[PDB]
Write a protein that binds this DNA or RNA. Structure first.
Length: 290
DNA sequence: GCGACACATAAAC
DNA sequence: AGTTTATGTGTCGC
């Protein structure tokens, strides 16, 4: 009934079929590593502004809630939360150096203001985009919102156990414990060490995330989970790393910029999951029917 | 099949 | 040690 795999950090992922077994909502058995991500492609090259060195980039994503591996399929539930986390790394540049440097897109050179991640859901068979929604912990007693673009600096991805532990922390002392893992506070650096043109100082806010954490995520309530043939639709979750540039023929999305104008999120790299099945609200998707 | 409201139960403190 | 929080899911009414 429960199939167990050891995660990288020694925690377990415990896969079970909610059609057959009901587990408590706050059980640690609801936390588990989801499907592994794969490269879709690399897009615009990025170079350091004096050396000309190409910046090596890699997205490091993981799903930590919401998906079970059940007989060779990855299965989620429309009504339930998933968690998708991601960082990125720069193989050839340590963070401290990276933040003092400046970088251009090779298209002919657009200056990078900052790096950021976004996520999307798609129908994996036809590339149609599917809406995602997020809640706060208050769920129906708080607002609903669509996942946002997350400015980020390079960082290792926290272990599954760390994401689990930090999921519902309010206590101030405990929050302090995790702060350095999730945030860089630009207002606490020595400003005299940095040039006006430095990458750190073109980030839009002082509080800069080191990890993009999309928690309490669902597919939009209106998604059809089956095809007309009654076969399951196949979905995929995508993570896109971009460079945000000032707007004034390569893939990009428009972005609501800080100063009011509309800039460009220029694609750098994209990863996606294998095909995903989503179980809808039908009673037959739950053990209560049996 | 979906929005709303309800109940239940382990985590968080 | 008890209370509140957070979240899977049961149920009602259209």
């Amino acid at each position: 009934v429960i199939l167990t795999q050891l995660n990288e950090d020694g925690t377990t992922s415990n896969y079970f079929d909610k059609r057959k077994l009901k587990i408590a909502p706050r059980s640690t058995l609801q936390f588990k590593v989801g499907p592994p991500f794969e490269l879709v492609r690399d897009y615009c090259p990025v170079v350091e502004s004096h050396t000309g060195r190409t910046l090596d980039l890699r997205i490091i994503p993981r799903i930590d809630r919401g998906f079970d591996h059940i007989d060779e399929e990855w299965v989620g539930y429309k009504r339930n939360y998933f968690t998708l986390v991601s960082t990125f790394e720069t193989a050839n540049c340590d963070l401290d150096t990276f933040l003092k440097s400046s970088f251009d897109l090779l298209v002919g050179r657009l200056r990078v203001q900052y790096f950021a991640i976004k996520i999307k859901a798609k129908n994996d068979d036809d590339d149609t985009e599917i809406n995602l929604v997020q809640h706060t912990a208050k769920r129906d007693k708080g607002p609903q919102f669509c996942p946002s673009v997350c400015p980020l600096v390079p960082s290792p991805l926290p272990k599954h156990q760390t994401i689990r532990e930090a999921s519902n922390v309010r206590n101030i002392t405990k929050m302090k414990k995790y702060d350095s893992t999730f945030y860089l506070h630009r207002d606490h650096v020595n400003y005299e060490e940095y040039g006006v043109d430095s990458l750190l100082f073109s980030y839009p806010e002082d509080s800069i995330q080191k990890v993009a954490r999309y928690e309490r995520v669902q597919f939009a309530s209106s998604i059809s989970v089956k095809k007309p043939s009654q076969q399951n639709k196949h979905f995929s979750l995508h993570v896109i790393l971009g460079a945000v540039v000032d707007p004034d023929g390569i893939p990009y999305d428009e972005l609501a910029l800080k100063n009011g104008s509309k800039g460009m999120f220029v694609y750098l790299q994209e990863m996606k999951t294998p095909p995903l099945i989503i179980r809808g609200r039908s009673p037959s998707n739950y053990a209560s029917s049996q």
